[PDB]
Amino acid sequence: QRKVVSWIDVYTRATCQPREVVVPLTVELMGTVAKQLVPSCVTVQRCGGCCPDDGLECVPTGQHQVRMQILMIRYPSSQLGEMSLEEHSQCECRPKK
Amino acid sequence: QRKVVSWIDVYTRATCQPREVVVPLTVELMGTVAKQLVPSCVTVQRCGGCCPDDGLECVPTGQHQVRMQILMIRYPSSQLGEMSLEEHSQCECRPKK
């Protein structure tokens, strides 16, 4: 009926690290090849969370662009093509300049 | 050097389900317990992603509120206290209005 999440278990996942984030696919962010693509959103490892001391930003150190297979709904002929998004590798807590 | 992601693996994590999402701790969401809460953000299971059809929205079926141990920076005496947040259990795709 009830569970108390330990503070250690709280901050471990809260710290600035690479994590799975849903990214909505738009005509502005990744362009137009068809009217709409399926799925209309994807998941990539991004730098999320928060630093212990206020005054330190959560920013990526290294990043690599990954390519994913996406279903492109085109009217001449619908095809399963390829797309690309920028994915983060590792993050660090740097002081906010 | 790089590698491709299979479309099955693309949509599986992209489909509407419960997933780990970072939530920034704000005074608008949780009131005065400290000037700064540590960590300043936490992680809860939330309904993210997108449904296959355009007229289908991603909404939670049922939710259970979980409580987490949080360090409250109080200048009279700093204490490791307790706070609560709403967390989803399962999600579904419904037609829109």
Partner: antibody, heavy 120, light 108 residues
């Protein structure tokens, strides 16, 4: 999967200095304080100093006032301890552990240790 | 430096006994105490890190108690796991001060 690495054995001569290693692997290194603790054979734990690899802010114990120097490396993810001018009294096992916040001071994960022997 | 004091060091008890290890501080640390477990091979792990809050992978036998100047680590059921020296460390202010490691032998 989260752990700290310390070379178990370390040999030096009286007068010499050691650069002890604390290789961190399994977590975001620059988000946790790295503490260093001294322990004599069958004695209590003595806090030497802690270092924040995130900003570079350091703190040393008063009695180790000139004798520990703490450094960090963002590449390779390793924390260091520079024990300047060693004597026979400094022959002890040195640990490295990590805590999270400024207020709690709770080091959750420790290293295996570094048994520093000095004799020549 | 706050002189964190452990009155007892030599301790021996039979299996399945309520074993209590206490600590006394020089001043009020406001519930900021952490109990550590140093195994015979020198490996140190964190058992209870507040008043009574458990670290990941620690049996419910270890119970944390004490509110102010007086705190105690209480093992509800003693086994053969639980052969180690137990330290308490204050977290009120720097430095972080450790007490005298109480050796826990088991009676047979």
């Amino acid at each position: 999967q989260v752990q700290l690495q310390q070379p178990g054995t370390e040999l030096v001569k009286p007068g010499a200095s050691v650069k002890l290693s604390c290789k961190a692997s399994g977590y975001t290194f620059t988000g946790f304080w790295i503490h260093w603790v001294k322990q004599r054979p069958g004695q209590g734990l003595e806090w030497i100093g802690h270092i924040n690899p995130g900003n570079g802010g350091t703190n040393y114990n008063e009695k180790f006032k000139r004798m520990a120097t703490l450094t960090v490396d963002k590449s390779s993810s390793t924390a260091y301890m520079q024990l300047s001018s060693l004597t026979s009294e400094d022959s002890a096992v040195y640990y490295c552990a990590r805590s999270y916040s400024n207020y709690v001071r709770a080091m959750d994960y420790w290293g295996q240790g570094t048994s520093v022997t000095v004799s020549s | 430096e706050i002189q964190m004091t452990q009155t007892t060091s030599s301790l021996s008890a039979s299996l399945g006994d309520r074993v209590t290890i206490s600590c006394r501080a020089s001043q009020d640390i406001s519930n900021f105490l952490n109990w550590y477990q140093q195994k015979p091979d020198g490996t140190v792990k964190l058992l209870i890190y507040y008043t009574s809050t458990l670290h990941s992978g620690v049996p419910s036998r270890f119970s944390g108690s004490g509110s102010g100047t007086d705190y105690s680590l209480t093992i509800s059921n003693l086994e053969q796991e639980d052969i180690a020296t137990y330290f308490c460390q204050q977290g009120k202010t720097l430095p972080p001060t450790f007490g005298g490691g109480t050796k826990l032998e088991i009676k047979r």
